[PDB]
């Protein structure tokens with residue numbers, strides 16, 4: 248049961264478009280009453296997404312402040328982040344140092360652990376879904392887009408876990424985080440091929456390598472960290488707790 252609005256333009260003052268999605272559009276707006284700036288996700292599974300966001304409150308996760316129904320369109324009023332996505336900053340940098348990447352992955356693990364503890368699994372972690380709070384180089388990262396998250400009971404290739412592809416659980420996110428760590432360290436994905444079917448085979452078989460010379464001087468500890476997240480067997484795969492403990496992070 249969400250609020251109805253005759254027109255959202257009465258409540259919010261729309262400015263620039265911040266971004267677009269397959270089925271959404273994100274606009275910078277001003278709350279007319281409080282004069283604060285917000286990011287409004289406009290949409291023309293979504294109920295799953297909302298239910299999830301209502302359980303969540305973490306400094307490194309984009310908050311849902313409220314929702315309005317107006318003219319067949321949902322308007323998710325959301326915490327504004329202005330730093331753009333991690334994907335872009337990997338491009339405008341090439342790769343991260345071990346120290347910087349480790350700080351970033353910490354903030355990610357901290358947040359996903361908080362979710363796993365709430366029985367929430369994101370299922371779509373990737374650089375494009377990680378948003379910086381600010382333009383400043385020191386800005387914290389924020390987890391966003393819960394459009395595919397699943398709550399416990401009583402996806403982009405490259406980042407999805409082998410078992411997800413063999414068919415259609417918390418281990419899923421831990422794989423993704425390993426792949427994000429791999430990319431931050433070396434600047435390119437662990438799975439890469441021109442043929443989609445071959446690519447799809449690589450991920451299923453979970454065959455990747457810290458290839459020389461790119462990986463030559465990356466620490467054994469970083470590599471051990473990645474192997475333990477990027478582990479084929481979901482049973483043996485590191486949890487967020489085990490990954491937080493690992494010396495590369497701690």
Ligand SMILES: Nc1ncnc2c1ncn2[C@@H]1O[C@H](COP(=O)(O)OP(=O)(O)OP(=O)(O)O)[C@@H](O)[C@H]1O
Pocket residue numbers: 265266267268269270271273286288309325326327328329331332375376391392394
């Ligand atoms: N809270 C926010 N603050 C600032 N910008 C945002 C915010 N949320 C999303 N954006 C921008 O808009 C884009 C919207 O994408 P989103 O996170 O919704 O995932 P998507 O797959 O692109 O869209 P969707 O999943 O809703 O179809 C983001 O990549 C980002 O650039």
